[PDB]
């Protein structure tokens, strides 16, 4: 049925984040509220294009933008960050309700050195009007042409010519 052409191995070398889950989830909200610009249009690319291959250009940017956020903490209160994310992992659910004191310590540090405020409840869960440059695909499913529907029935009803016309029956 054809060619399954896919991107080469050349473009699949991004500076992959080397962190673990706990440190990923320890920041989470601040990372989500400070790196939304590359997240939104890339995810919008994932939905609109309906194909992973066409969103490689945005796929690397979100990973790259993560590093700029991540190393920004290293030049700042990363020691409170280490104490935080090294206390989250100890819980099996990776739950924040048991690490509230370090939640404050990370928040109070990031509040003034950088200014990333704590996202209020429900703020992340919000549809956003992400600006984009790419035009919308003409057919995201690459749908082919459509069969022409059968001609529509019309015309005023007329009495059945010569009645029932079934064997000898008339009228």
């Amino acid at each position: 049925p054809g060619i399954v052409e896919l991107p080469t191995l050349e473009d699949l070398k991004v500076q992959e984040v080397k962190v673990s889950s706990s440190v990923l989830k320890a920041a989470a909200h601040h990372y989500g509220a400070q790196c939304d610009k590359p997240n939104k249009e890339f995810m919008l690319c994932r939905w609109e294009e309906k194909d992973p291959r066409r969103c490689l250009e945005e796929g690397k940017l979100v990973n790259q933008c993560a590093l700029d956020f991540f190393r920004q903490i290293k030049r700042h209160c990363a020691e409170p960050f280490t104490e935080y994310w090294t206390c989250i992992d100890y819980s099996g659910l990776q739950l924040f309700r048991h690490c509230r004191k370090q939640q404050a310590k990370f928040d109070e540090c990031v509040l003034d050195k950088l200014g990333w405020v704590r996202p209020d409840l429900g703020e992340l869960s919000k549809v956003t009007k992400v600006k984009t440059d790419r035009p919308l695909p003409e057919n995201p499913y690459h749908s082919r042409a459509r069969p022409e529907p059968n001609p529509e029935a019309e015309g005023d009803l007329k009495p059945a010519k010569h009645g029932s016309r079934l064997f000898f029956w008339t009228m």
């Binding site: 995810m43 992973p52 059968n150």
Partner: protein, 63 residues
């Protein structure tokens, strides 16, 4: 009554019979052809409506 009564009456019957005969043969041609190519008002066997289908975004990007 006069023979002209039966003459005209039979002719009207013959015309009615011929049109009835001609229409019957055409119906056997219409119904069979419609059952073959399908592009007709009847014999349209039911399908699934294109309205009952969710087009809102899913939970998985590709679809």
């Amino acid at each position: 009554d006069g023979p002209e009564k039966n003459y005209e009456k039979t002719m009207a019957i013959l015309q009615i019979e011929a049109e009835k005969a001609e229409l019957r043969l055409k119906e056997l041609e219409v119904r069979r052809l419609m059952r073959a190519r399908g592009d007709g008002p009847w014999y349209q066997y039911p399908t699934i409506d294109k309205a009952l289908i969710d087009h809102s975004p899913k939970t998985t990007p590709d679809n």
